[PDB]
Amino acid sequence: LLDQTSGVPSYFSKGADRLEEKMSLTVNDPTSATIYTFMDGDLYIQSTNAEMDKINKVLA
Amino acid sequence: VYVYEETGHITVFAHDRNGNLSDTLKEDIIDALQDYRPSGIMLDVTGVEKEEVNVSATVTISNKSRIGDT
Amino acid sequence: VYVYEETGHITVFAHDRNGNLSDTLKEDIIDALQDYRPSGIMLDVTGVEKEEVNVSATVTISNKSRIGDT
């Protein structure tokens, strides 16, 4: 993230920072976005193609 | 005077007897260090990071009659 | 010594009379350069690119009595 033109550390080398957003996988955290659900180690509901909540609500 | 060196920048810490750096004295230092600094290098002047230590002491004394303001 | 110069960077290639550059000698060179090097510019000291020529020579001699170790 330092100045690529100079390519060395220096007084003028530092600049803007970066916001990194790494995804991780959870088990039962309610705050996380659920992607799958299981009942006694068995899959609960499938979805063969793209999921769209608002669209599906209209279609229903 | 303490000189701290960095790549492409120079910063000069100075203080008077009191530990302060007046703006006028800062300008004088800058003007005098125009002739000294290298070409193509940046020079900056700053005050010394003064630290005023407050000291409350309790002094035990032997001669109680000599206790006074002086 | 060969001073190799770049924008904002200095490389000092140095060697002793054998062509080596020991760490103690490098530190001593650095310490001697503190007084001389320009302020605010990066400086680095490294050993020369030494090449180590082995030689094997076949030589013929006209007077063959002179052959020997001398």
Query: Which residue in chain B has the smallest CA separation from C37?
Result: B38
Cα–Cα distance, C10 to C51 (Å, whole number): 23
Method of structure determination: cryo-EM
Strand ranges inside chain A, DSSP E: 38-39, 42-43
C10 within 8 A of C44, measured Cβ to Cβ:
yes
Alpha carbon of residue C29 to chain centroid: 14
Cα–Cα distance, B43 to B8 (Å, whole number): 9
Query: What are all long-range contacts of A43-47, with beta carbons under 8 Å and residues at least 24 apart?
Result: none
A14, two tokens: 């530092």
With an 8 Å Cβ cutoff, is B35 touching chain C? no
A44 within 8 A of A38, measured Cβ to Cβ:
yes
Q: Determine whether the interchain pair C38/B41 forms a contact, defined as Cβ–Cβ distance below 8 Å.
A: yes
Q: Determine whether the interchain pair B5/C39 forms a contact, defined as Cβ–Cβ distance below 8 Å.
A: yes
> In 10 A of CB B33, how many CB atoms?
14
- Strand-by-strand arrangement of the B9-14 sheet: B2-6, B9-14, B42-47
- Token pair 């992607």 is found at A35
Give the single-character DSSP code of B47.
Answer: E
Chains that touch B (3 or more CB pairs under 8 A): A, C
Q: List, in sequence order, every residue forming a beta bridge with B9; answer none if it has no partner.
A: B6, B42
What's the resolution in A? 4.0
C6, two tokens: 């770049």
